[PDB]
Symmetry: C2
Subunit: 111 residues, 2 copies
Amino acid sequence: ELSPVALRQMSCAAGTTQTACTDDNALAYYNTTKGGRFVLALLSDLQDLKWARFPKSDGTGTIYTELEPPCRFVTDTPKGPKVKYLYFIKGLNNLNRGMVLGSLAATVRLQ
Amino acid sequence: NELSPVALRQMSCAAGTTQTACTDDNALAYYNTTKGGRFVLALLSDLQDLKWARFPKSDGTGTIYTELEPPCRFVTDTPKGPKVKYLYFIKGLNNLNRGMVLGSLAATVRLQ
């Protein structure tokens, strides 16, 4: 059926270009199925990101994914509201967009 | 531009195999608090044969019955041990809202 699979988070590199992916500057929401991680969305403080870099665990190589235009949103932080940017993977369907938003509501102090 | 952020609220509710069979709180409803009215997305229940959910109207006028999709079965890890649960989407729920419920569940519950 549509059995729910756990959405996990991990830090990851992202940048304006693929070469620009420098050091961990974002947080990736991903799925773990079969052999490999399925990244659904990026979470970051930066608003001009276009790419995300992911090294597979086996070290065979690294994966670059195009990012959609970011969805700006606000989180509640002890030091006051903070503005974050939510990047869906390019071409992400609405079902997986929903799962991201559902997981984001649970792992982040929204509004 | 700005993203629409909604928190999935949960509330105990009545359910049954028929509209008349809806009496006690047999399930918990995932809903959204909108400007006015509660928008129910899905039902979570120990029972696997549910078809309707009942919500007495806030205005006191009557009761609302929303029909259920076929249940999705899954196992949660609880202190009492693994518990078989059944997830019912509201009849006709779009894919975004379905993902919202599926994303909230897997982010807040341990699955087997």
